[PDB]
Design a protein around this ligand. Structure first.
Ligand SMILES: C=CCCn1cc(-c2cc(C3([S@](C)(=N)=O)CC3)nc(-c3ccnc4[nH]ccc34)n2)c2cc[nH]c2c1=O
Length: 247
């Protein structure tokens, strides 16, 4: 079972990062009853013990989902402690070691990832995802003043955001989904794109400048999809065929 082999590699990387100097504050969940404002500032807590338990629950089918959770440890430290705090440097040292190990094992990891999910090697899936990513970076992120939608809201700067928006979305998360080949057709992609606009209507109001920007993001998305409709339709057909053959 390639999921077992993958999980054993990921656990070995956790063992290696746990062994780096001064990393203990990241080995287990923050005690939010001691660090009393922690959840008022941090939205996605993560630590090496939770990461290991997730590896064992088979939650990570690839390098990328594991690395995204590992990166939360660094991002959380940067937000709570500060970008140059020694704790953030320590957490970064674990992410750096992870990247070294993933690089060392990249061919084996690619093979396991392909055995777990054959669509990651499907040329039509790859071409489709490449087009979506180009739409996001060259058209949607090029909308003037679209910066509020490029990355997840940091609760440190907008403290009530996630009490209002419980199903958040942003363009970086969409790009990560594309990189993970989450989207097999335009429908799921447009579900996430439209969630950005719906959340702006809810949080900012229908007449806010934020919402006008989100509307323009959605509109240039539709326009660019229409320009590539015939290629995208063929790719979606061939992806569906690959998905059915994987049965
Ligand atoms: C992705 C969809 C969310 C859309 N969005 C996003 C924001 C937003 C985002 C960001 C980030 S950050 C730096 N990573 O937090 C880059 C994302 N910074 C700030 C910010 C940070 C400090 N002071 C501020 N003064 C006014 C805004 C502001 N604001 C927002 C603020 C009010 N409404 C909305 C809204 O609807």
């Amino acid at each position: 079972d390639p999921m077992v082999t993958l999980s054993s590699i990921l656990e070995s990387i956790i063992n290696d990062m746990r062994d780096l100097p001064n990393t203990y504050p990241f080995h287990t969940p923050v005690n939010a009853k001691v660090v009393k404002d922690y959840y008022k500032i941090i939205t996605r807590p993560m630590d090496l013990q939770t990461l290991r338990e997730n590896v064992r629950k088979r939650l990570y089918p690839s390098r990328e989902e594991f690395r995204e959770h590992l990166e939360l440890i660094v991002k959380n430290s940067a937000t709570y402690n500060g970008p140059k705090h020694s704790l953030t440097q320590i957490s970064q040292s674990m992410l750096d070691l992870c990247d070294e190990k993933l690089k060392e094992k990249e061919d084996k990891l690619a093979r396991l990832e392909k055995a777990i999910n054959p669509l990651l090697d499907d040329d039509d899936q790859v071409a489709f995802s490449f087009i979506l990513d180009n739409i996001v970076t060259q058209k949607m992120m090029a909308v003037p003043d679209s910066w509020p939608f490029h990355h997840p809201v940091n609760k440190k700067f907008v403290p009530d955001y996630y009490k209002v928006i419980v199903n958040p979305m942003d363009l970086e998360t969409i790009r990560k989904n594309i990189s993970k080949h989450k989207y097999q057709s335009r429908e799921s992609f447009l579900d996430d794109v439209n969630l950005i606009l719906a959340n702006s209507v809810k949080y900012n109001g229908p007449e806010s400048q934020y919402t006008k920007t989100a509307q323009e993001i959605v509109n240039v998305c539709y326009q660019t999809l229409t320009e590539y409709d015939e290629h995208l339709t063929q790719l979606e057909k061939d992806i569906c065929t690959a998905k059915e053959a994987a049965l």
